[PDB]
Amino acid sequence: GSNNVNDLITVTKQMITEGIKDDGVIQAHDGEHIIYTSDFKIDNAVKAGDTMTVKYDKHTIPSDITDDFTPVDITDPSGEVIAKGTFDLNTKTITYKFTDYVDRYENVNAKLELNSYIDKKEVPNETNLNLTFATADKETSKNVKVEYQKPIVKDESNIQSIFSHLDTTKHEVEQTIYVNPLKLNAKNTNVTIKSGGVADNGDYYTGDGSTIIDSNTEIKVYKVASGQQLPQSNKIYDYSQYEDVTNSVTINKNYGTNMANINFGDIDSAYIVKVVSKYTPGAEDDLAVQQGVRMTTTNKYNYSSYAGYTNTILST
Ligand SMILES: [Ca+2]
Ligand SMILES: [Ca+2]
């Protein structure tokens, strides 16, 4: 009892490459793909319903922002489907189930290409990785550096953010914002969150996407203790670790049109702000989702200083 036929798969070439620039450096916050390509022969003895496995490196994941991990089919050059796959998160393994393609054709070889992202649960901070991808029996490895973003800093105003989750059925996006990650003395701290853009220097711009921010937007604020270090990945997997101070700060969800503001007053600590807001779906399946943050503080010369950040998701 075992429909697995990896023993009948002959892998003739495998490769690990990158989606943006073959750096040896993965730009995880620019959504740089880690690409696994594998060429192989399928024995004639393989039949419809047999399965083969392919293993991701544990530090990668088929999607960095949604929970849909459905793998691309294995096809021939004309797009005829050779095998359909199901992904198992815990083992980071695809099980491909062969279609009747392998009953209809013989002496078949194929290629598959898998796009993956760094798994931020497994890669909290910048680090070196020896990635290993496996089409059992065969393994291929590559050493890389994972790099994350840095905050925009203008005097005591310092801030960064990512879209950490996207739900395309509920049409909600999650923004994880690091406020004052540098743990500076930020006087009269305000953080504004708005649909569209916020330039690095704080300037608002319409931008190339939009969200809905109103009285029903969810906004949570968490204080970071001085002994705590935030993951450079900008994604938090357990918020109970942090002090919920949502009722301690002043939050105006109607600060403007699709625009909210959080008044922190004087702080000496980092904070995490997690925002869940709705977006307007695109008629086909097109996404134009964009939301920006501005941090305002009072600098030592008693003028406002501004720092800005914008996250964007665009489709096809
Ligand atoms: Ca790269
Ligand atoms: Ca066959």
Author numbering: 1 to 316
Text of the article:
The gene identified from chromosomal DNA isolated from S. aureus subsp. aureusTCH60 encodes bone sialoprotein-binding protein (Bbp) with 1149 amino acids, containing SD-repeats of 154 residues and the ligand-binding A region from 53 to 601 residues further divided into N1, N2 and N3 domains. As a bifunctional MSCRAMM, Bbp also recognizes the human Fg α chain and inhibits thrombin induced blood coagulation.
Based on sequence alignment of Bbp, SdrG and ClfA, we engineered a plasmid that would generate a recombinant fusion protein covering residues Asn273–Pro598 of Bbp from S. aureus, a segment containing both N2 and N3 domains, with N-terminal GST-tag for purification purposes in Escherichia coli. The apo-Bbp273−598 folds into two distinct domains N2 and N3, both of which have two layers of β-sheets and are structurally similar to the Dev-IgG fold, a variant of IgG fold. The two β-sheets of the N2 domain are composed of A, B and E strands on one side and C, D, D1, F and G strands on the opposite side. In N3 domain, C′, D1′, D2′, F′ and G′ strands form one principal sheet and A′, B′, D′ and E′ strands contribute to the facing sheet. The additional D1′ and D2′ strands present the featured Dev-IgG fold. One difference occurs with regard to the D strand in N2 domain, which parallels with E strand, although exhibiting an antiparallel orientation with the corresponding strand in the description of SdrG, ClfB and ClfA. In the apo-Bbp273−598 structure, the C-terminus with poor electron density extends into the solvent region, thus leading to an open groove.
